[PDB]
């Protein structure tokens, strides 16, 4: 007897793995992983083995997988939509949590749940219809998000005293709510801007999640709905040990419930080191659409890429912190756009920067590696189907991010992972290391 | 000729530093700081030291120094204000910044500059007259925050290209508009909140910072505006390790302003383990006055401490991160307690824990620190000085905490610290790390 609730299922996976790291640390606490040194300690942990994190695996060579679900395995084996042919994010939303590759049936419970929870209180939305024009989609959509720690079931526990065990619990509460309202605040803030006077009407809880948002947009055409879809399930995880992933660790782990924990980590996004180089290499592309002018020979196109190298600058969406090679999350977005939009003028010169740029930092050597980013190619894509206010583009990152980050947040807390409490040291006193020493 | 300004000594003194720590890494890049340890790696960074961070030093038995400058060295050779016994925390920020103690003149500069750059936007004021009454003064508080980046000129120099070394410049200004409009802020959700009705008027720029806030608080008495200079002098930095200084410095090297690189940090103070247990040790200290009632021995004391113990609780204001050692913190706040209040019922029982609480806990050894905190003491005094809201506690911990975060931010745009990208492990790559490797 009985049917689907990701709660239950919980219930039955957690323990088994609290006593299996159990085993694990009784054994190899004991263990020597890495090594610590003044480069890394002065060069922001880049090597530096710092976290566990489960909801996601970086390869330098391969990357992300999702379980050891590699996108084109989620790609194919991740339930699809009723009438396309993409990963819909509520069967990565499962896979993530579970380790297990969903039932249609266990993502449609996943889907009315998410849009049965998916109402926003009174004073978000005043706030937001308040935000002025002049204000970032991302500064505002932390405030509301920052704001929404009113709704927080787990923050209303803790104040009287729910015992340690539970813990996990309440957080999934919050988090699936907060998944849920995500949405309609993405949405809404985009509707006060850019289209600013109409609504961002009903949820009709007989469509997903992604859609629910496309139609809350007020986007009208099918195919940007895959596209979104897809979008949703690739910026999800991307290992910890990013920057809004381990903000949001972090802030989560001094047991501040997941609306405050998300909304530090957007802000961790917000940094245009972080997030934002989505949204600039169309910046770069209205600047190279301007200022190196319409039509040029990759020479000038080259010099406009020396342009900005020497001008001391960031050339965003190519490269990466960790990953030596192309992301498959390039490679990803390509076979999409292949298949509906290969006739486009920056489409092409897309796979135009696909042959000149790194090569600029093979010239370079700037860092290690040259290839494709995600950066990159979804701008492209977001144009195509008359996306175009480029500050959004991040808070739909942040959409899809939330998969991932809430993930696992629910993780740590039936784990009882405790506070992420570094040394940190001083230059002279480090001096008085390794040297003085 | 000429007159005081922060900003002149800081080209002098930035330089001088990078070339420093230049030579520092040539030679000791190649140097193997400590291990990585499996546990470590399961239990939150503790002991694995993460950074270098120049603003303060924590020491286990020593506690904070500011440069080297322990709290009673400050408390003294930091400038006090015109009529008064206690450290001037504009003197503080001076300390930090400089390596330098101030002089009374630019600390007057430091005074005056701050209730200059103190004007609030529009729309800050529009949305904290829009917050209902069943937010905390925090989520109050950072959404505010997040909102006041709109007044980030540094989010605005970068949108138009200015040069990587020019950073901590922006980065300058944006801080000193933030340090500033904060307590403006802080004071203005206090007066929504508690104080229903009431403006929070004046600024005297001839007036100090912590002066002006009392002033904006609805808060007379002269005594109560020498505990929150001193207050706002001990909660202002300690290290890099902890979460909201930790927290800012990461989504500070993402390149995000001061505002949003804040108010992240906010969140992460706003923890229940991190700073809301201000708050809690006068949670319990209600449940004390409850529900062991009014007048009791150390026995149903001690019974009451136990069954908070084994009903697997926190208890707060004992123990400590990395502090095996009694907070200078605390015996800071006693030796003002003696001097003004030693009539106490909350006093002299505030050292009724002072020789029974750890006692417990070395019934227990639950954690490694058997003296005092911080978060302790502080809120005995509140109520001393008729502060009773104990939810807006730890919305007085941020204000101080602005200096010290504001503090290392512009030392790291300045050094230009990279982007924190550490690495995260997954359970079962890690199983296959150890002991299949
Ligand atoms: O891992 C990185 O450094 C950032 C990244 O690509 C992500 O967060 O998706
Ligand atoms: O360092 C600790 O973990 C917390 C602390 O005392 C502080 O943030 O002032």
Redesign the interface.
């Known amino acids: 007897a009985s049917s689907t609730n990701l709660k239950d299922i919980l219930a039955d996976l957690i323990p088994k793995?609290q006593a299996?790291?159990k085993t694990?640390?009784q054994?190899?606490?004991?263990?020597?992983?890495?090594?610590?040194?003044?480069?890394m300690?002065?060069?922001?942990?880049?090597?530096?083995?710092?976290?566990?994190?489960?909801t996601?695996?970086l390869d330098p060579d391969e990357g992300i997988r999702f379980r050891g679900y590699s996108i084109p395995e989620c790609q194919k084996m991740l339930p699809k939509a009723k009438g396309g042919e993409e990963p819909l994010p509520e069967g990565l939303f499962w896979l993530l949590v579970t380790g297990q590759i969903p039932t249609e049936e266990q993502v449609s419970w996943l889907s009315k749940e998410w849009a049965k929870r998916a109402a926003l209180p009174s004073?978000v939305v005043?706030?937001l219809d308040?935000?002025?024009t002049?204000?970032?989609p991302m500064?505002?959509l932390?405030?509301?998000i920052?704001?929404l720690?009113?709704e927080s079931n787990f923050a209303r526990a803790?104040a009287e005293?729910i015992?340690?065990?539970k813990y996990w619990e309440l957080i999934y509460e919050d988090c699936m709510d907060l998944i849920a309202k995500l949405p309609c605040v993405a949405a809404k803030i985009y509707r006060n801007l850019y289209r600013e006077g109409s609504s961002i009407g009903a949820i009709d809880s007989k469509l997903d999640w992604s859609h629910n948002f496309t139609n809350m947009l007020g986007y009208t055409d099918a195919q940007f709905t895959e596209l979104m879809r897809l979008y949703l399930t690739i910026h999800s995880d991307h290992?910890?040990?990013?920057?809004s992933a381990?903000?949001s660790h972090?802030?989560g782990?001094?047991?501040?419930d997941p609306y405050?924990?998300f909304?530090?980590?957007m802000?961790?996004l917000?940094?245009?080191?972080?997030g934002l180089a989505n949204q600039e290499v169309l910046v770069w592309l209205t600047q190279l659409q301007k200022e190196v002018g319409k039509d040029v020979s990759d020479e000038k196109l080259r010099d406009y890429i020396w342009n900005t190298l020497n001008?001391?600058?960031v050339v965003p969406g190519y490269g990466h912190?960790?990953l030596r090679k192309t992301d498959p999350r390039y490679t990803c977005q390509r076979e999409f756009a292949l298949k509906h939009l290969p006739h486009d003028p920056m489409f092409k010169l897309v796979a135009q920067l696909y042959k000149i740029v790194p090569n600029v930092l093979l010239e370079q050597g700037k860092a290690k590696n040259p290839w494709p980013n995600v950066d990159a190619h979804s701008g492209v894509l977001l144009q195509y189907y008359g996306m175009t206010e480029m500050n959004y583009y991040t808070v739909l990152f942040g959409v899809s991010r939330a998969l991932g980050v809430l993930a696992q947040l629910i993780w740590s807390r039936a784990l009882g992972?405790?506070?992420?409490?570094?040394?940190?040291?001083?230059?002279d006193?480090?001096?008085k290391?390794?040297?003085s020493k």
């Open positions: 793995e299996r790291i694990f640390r054994q190899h606490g004991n263990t020597v992983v890495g090594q610590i040194t003044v480069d300690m002065y060069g922001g942990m880049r090597g530096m083995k710092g976290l566990v994190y489960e996601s695996v004073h005043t706030m308040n935000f002025p002049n204000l970032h500064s505002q932390s405030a509301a920052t704001a720690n009113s803790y005293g015992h340690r065990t290992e910890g040990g990013n920057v381990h903000t972090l802030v782990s001094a047991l501040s405050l924990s909304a530090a980590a802000n961790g917000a940094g245009p080191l972080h001008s001391g600058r912190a960790v992972f405790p506070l992420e409490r570094p040394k940190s040291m001083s230059t006193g480090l001096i290391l390794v040297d």
